[PDB]
Structures are given as C-alpha cells and as structure tokens.
Design a protein around this ligand. Sequence first.
Ligand SMILES: CC(=O)N[C@@H](CCCNC(=N)N)C(=O)O
Ligand SMILES: O=C(O)CCC(=O)C(=O)O
Ligand SMILES: [Fe+2]
Length: 316
Amino acid sequence: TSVDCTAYGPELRALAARLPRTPRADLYAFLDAAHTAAASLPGALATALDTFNAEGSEDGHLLLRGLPVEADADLPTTPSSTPAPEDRSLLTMEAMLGLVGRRLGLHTGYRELRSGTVYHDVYPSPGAHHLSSETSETLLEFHTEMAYHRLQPNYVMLACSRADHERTAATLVASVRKALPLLDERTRARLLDRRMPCCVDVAFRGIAQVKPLYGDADDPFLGYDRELLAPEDPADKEAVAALSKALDEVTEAVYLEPGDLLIVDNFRTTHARTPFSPRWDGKDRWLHRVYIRTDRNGQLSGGERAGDVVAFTPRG
Ligand SMILES: CC(=O)N[C@@H](CCCNC(=N)N)C(=O)O
Ligand SMILES: O=C(O)CCC(=O)C(=O)O
Ligand SMILES: [Fe+2]
C-alpha cells in the first residue's frame, strides 16, 4: 500500500527540526521527542499509519514515498562500517523513522545484533556473509525478521537515503494474506500453530521452534525464513514447500528510492532483496533500518521504552 507524502514535505521537515540533532547521544530523549512530535503528523498521514498499525493490509506493507531527504551532495559519504558514531548528526530519513516509528510503537535494539544499536545503516560490504543485509551481488532470500526470537518485532522499517546506482536492488515482500488462499486446507491445517525447528541469524549464534502460521485460522500470522526454517518431518517439509511456493507466487517488489520509508508488517510478511553491484565509491546504496514493537502477541511485558535493547530468547 503506498502513500505519496510529497505535499507534507514542509510540515515534515518542521517536525524533524523539533528533534535533538545527535540522536544516539541520548536516544531515549530523542525518541521521546519523536513521540511528542508524531502526534502532529499531518492528519491524513497519521490516519494511514494508524489504520495500517491496527489492521495491516492485504499486501503487508505501507510504503511512504516522497518524504523529505537531503540532496545527495548534502548526505555524508555512505558508511563503510558499523556501528555508527554516537555523535553522528541526525539525517532526515532517520528523523522520519523516529516520527513514523513512534506513531507505530517502540523502537527496539537487540543486544547481540549490531552491537545493540537501534538505528542500523544498511549498505553493501565486500565479502559479506550470505545471510547479511550487507550482501549485494547475491540475492538476500525471503525471511520474516527474527521469526525465531520471542521478542521478534511487529515491524521492520527501511528508509532510503541512497538507492544503488543503477536502481536494480528491489526489496521483495510476500504477504500471508495473499499467499494463504493458494494453500489447500490440509496444508494450512498442518502449518497452523505447528512448531518447527528453526536456526537463528549469525548474530544470535552461541535452537528455536517457529510456527509458520499462527493465530486466528482465518487471518493467520506468518513466520517464514527460506534459509533458517528447518522442518524434519516429511509432512512438515511438504507443507512448508507449498507455503514457500505460494509466497513466491504473490511476491511484490519495491524499488526504494531516496525519501522512501517502507513499513513491513513483520508478523504477516517475509521480505528479500535482489542483487546489485556496489561501486565502493562513497555513494553506494544506503538505507536506515529500525525495528518497532507494538502491543500485539507478547512483544511487551511492561515498562518498555522506545530505545530499549532486549536480549535473545528463542521461541520454543
Ligand atoms: C536479524 C538479522 O540478522 N538479519 C540479517 C538479514 C536477514 C538474514 N537472512 C535470513 N535470516 N534468512 C541482517 O544481516 O541484518
Ligand atoms: O536491502 C533491503 O532492501 C532489505 C534488507 C533486509 O532484509 C533488512 O535490512 O532486513
Ligand atoms: Fe530483513
């Protein structure tokens, strides 16, 4: 689902201006400022975000296009390392992630991942591990983010400061609401609420059980990872292969361009990124990623604040 935010440019640049300019130096204060400012998002934008937050969508994602972003010459050189300097000045797309993210829920860091940071730069790196968001020339296959984590976030948000030079990297999304009707009853029934073994991302290494479909049988949530989900039982493997095929069959593509902020419903979709060739010239593709927790399905137990970092516990 898309929303052209071009008309909101001046108002959004004003809200971004309310925020502290060095976010990481006091991230709790920065996200608190963003929450207060989010109450002033232009009405139509706020309504769209709240509706998506409460109901999701059939296609599983809300793409905000045309948000303010610096001219390319005014952005820093694309980062070459992580984590980012705590003193880094606020970038406009990061301000958008603060405002939009707080309208939805609570930004969350994961202790073992990216040094426990909350804002992650997503750029290509040479010799990237194949499961890494730093990949470029190899397809980053479909995954629900951290499907195996008890504190898996409801949303993954990706804001774009630079697209890759040739604009070939496509962010793919497949929605359970479009895939489900393609599955027969036997398959849906085998998958629903059935725990299956699942490996974890490199950062969390050193076993999990994931239900590929779960919750209300007429509108289930989805936990799928093409690389990590590892059913052993043949009936389970067969049901997961049918799910895998249906997700491919309903794949949708978003080509992120500067000023875009894509909100992925991480309990109802799986996402991926197609190949692209980095130039290592200082202008490589550069997204900003944050994870947002909401009141749904046990993400929060009380007292959480946007900016908190949580430890790893596998679903079981
Ligand atoms: C949470 C996390 O580690 N995510 C990875 C990217 C997803 C890895 N792919 C699969 N899980 N199949 C990253 O490098 O950011
Ligand atoms: O590069 C992309 O478009 C998405 C990468 C991704 O899966 C992620 O950052 O979680
Ligand atoms: Fe991802």
